[model samples]
Target: TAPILLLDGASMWFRSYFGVPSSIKAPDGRPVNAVRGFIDAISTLVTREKPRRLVVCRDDDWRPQWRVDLIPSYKAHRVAEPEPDGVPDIEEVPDDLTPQVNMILELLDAFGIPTAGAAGFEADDVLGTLSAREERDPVVVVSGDRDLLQLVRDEPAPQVRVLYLGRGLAKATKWGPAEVAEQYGVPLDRAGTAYAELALLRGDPSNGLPGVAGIGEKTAASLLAKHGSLQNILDAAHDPKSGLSKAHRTKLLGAVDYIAAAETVVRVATDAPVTFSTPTDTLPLAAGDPARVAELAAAYGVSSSISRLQTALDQLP
Candidate 1:
């Protein structure tokens, strides 16, 4: 069976740059640790997962203006700067890492590894859209992003699972609806959707989401358990006979505006108009431009990594 692999480009690259020693440099004395690690990681993933189609999902706009308009503080914390300190990693783009990013893209293009992004949307949205649109195969989203746990699903034919790389690929957890439900304490039937709603209520300080003043993770989960959906909780808040506690009801009513805005901010969009760098995302047995790939490998001193990728490609059915 084939699984479509969707990689969060920035997230993985950040991990590669920070996790690998910067002493790894190119023929020009510039660091290529990210490039080396990224290529190696992809090679490892393809070899282990045996994906039939792969797309490196990119962030055309890491922080969309629309999200800012909805909530001024959305990712405002990272606006000034940018690590591997948290579960989802950080967005602090280092000066050295920036150039390596261009190098990685160039190398991928040379190898004809398909890349994709949506205008004004983060890679999360691209992953969301691509996974949601997939009908033929299961989807495996590779990312350090904790929010992506909300994308896990079990029903509707081919399952959508998240290969969470927050703890690195060796310890990566494959999250289906059951895993998400158990880990986050959301309902089993609606774990994917509930995860997003839980984040909306609890707020994510890492992303500048100021959740309701009183609702914490436990309370948010409890509310979702009792009320089912966020909208149901809101509806209960307005009804005196709905059995919602006065304190909870008051809290829900007070942050009505923020809740409305956070719905869009917290949940990833599944309908983004995605554009691909190549015509198709199918994994090729050989590099589309072997001459260019070889040239890049020699210039960047990544021939070993590129060779490993080719070997992995050859192993695919």
Candidate 2:
């Protein structure tokens, strides 16, 4: 009955920063909306999911160089310019929300809730690696990013599911392979990977992916339906007798370079070497330091939020 919950650290925090009111400020009057909301959100999920083990996966490198090396425009639009040329471009983050991240990290440490990250990989990669490697326990990855839908699976001993919060926690939907296949119109047998292929074809402006020029969601899904897989679709595009339409084939042929690079760009790394804040991923039964925990909670105006988290932890079986 206990699933391992993998929290996308940055994704939830960003949502928290915007979702919670700026009136939620610390003793210093700096906004702690992100910190408060993030803790509460985790508490809510814990109460609902009753996870036995949890790990807050960090974006060690939100915009990894390896992904950028494959597709130069990967998240390019989100890059904050005016930084030195030799240094990696910084992600544009709100000043108010930025400081709250550290506060959240500190609180997590005091709570003894382990956080995990891998060098040169984003939280998605860490989640992917953890979920992929787990031989026991069902994995319920919690993320606000639709890109993570690719991680859903149902085969083998313990299933992997995604608790997608793209629409926020109130409307969060749990996705399994069947749900992903039905929702995205991908083959049920390989819905997870197919969704990635569909995303690659349709592109995502938010992530700065300029997908194949003429293909959209419906067309990309239909292509997958007809050709079976991304490689098969490409093969069909190249074979005149394969019954691929001239217009679609021409467009696919034109974006061959992008298609090649986008595949690697879209798929999350399943073998990232992840490191954790604690020796175990088990949810801590008590705060690591009660005094520090109370200090940080009161300092950040997150006392009620932290209380809820502790209550949820107490409920864990």
Candidate 3:
């Protein structure tokens, strides 16, 4: 079976916006760093992996209300403003960066690269759901977001791996279950799923999750090692003779509500009804619309990046 590359649109764009200066502008003088950078990133991935197919996954909702309901602090800090209705709230994106998102998507359409997303779900959910039950044997999910590591699994069906680019692609690590376990001290047997369990205790400030106080990665890993899982930790916290220390037990017991909520907030939606585009769902041999692509290149001042992407696509098998 072939490899399917699930590219996280929002994550790459956000990283690109900061990685490349906003001084890169279009003919209309609109900054296009994000647009150019996105092209380069995707081109690099395609060149490196040479996957059979690709899908650009986006966050239908960055800070989903459903997750917010579970943990009100879920990405609350990144919420720039609220929306009226139906439309998701704006994430705290750079002023000049947001418009380039649309430009990149337009370029992708012109090139016939398919994209998929679900309402009320983040790109993590899209990647998780699509990669999990796919007909493809080996699925490669590329993202700058570490949370996507939760989707990394080794066996049973469509095996999953995350090409984590938190440090950029040059230093990117291809994370499988063995890598995740060795890094976090989670059980090797359940390394794939233990990532989420480890995160529940460690908490992530960036995402606005106030994890259990005093529980850093070391402690979190140790706790997961002590017990089998989060549920087991909770059970030990309640049990009088479960070998859990008085201090640890009290801390765990006090944060029962948070532990419960973080479980839902941290995990990706494996059940998302995900599918890629059909007719236009392919890597373009040439530009899907060459005239449009050329026009966009001139208008957006991204000819070099576009050319590189074209060369990468031409090189793909």
> TM-score: which candidate is best?
2
Ranking by lDDT: 2, 1, 3
TM-scores, one per candidate? 0.95, 0.96, 0.94
lDDT of 3 by residue, 8-38 (tens): 9988888898899878899899999989889
Candidate 3: misplaced stretches above 4 Å? 275-281
The clash number for model 2 is 0
Question: Model 1, range 58-147, lDDT digits (tens) per residue?
Answer: 998888877877998888777644322222324557778988998899988988899999888899999999998989899999999989
How much is 103 displaced in model 2, in angstroms?
0.3
Better candidate number, 2 or 3, judged by TM-score: 2
Which runs in model 1 stand beyond 4 Å of their true positions?
Answer: 81-91
**Candidates ranked, most accurate by TM-score first:** 2, 1, 3
| Global lDDT of model 3 | 0.84
Per-residue alpha-carbon lDDT of model 2 for 1-317, expressed as tens digits? 68999999999999999899999899899999999889999899889988879999998888888888889888988887634433456799998888999999999998889999988888999999999999889999999899999999888757899999889988997899899899989899999999999999999888899999999999999999988799999999888988999999999999999999999899999999999999999988779898999999998988998888888888877
Which pairs of residues collide in model 3? none
* Candidate 2 wrongly placed segments (more than 4 Å): 82-88
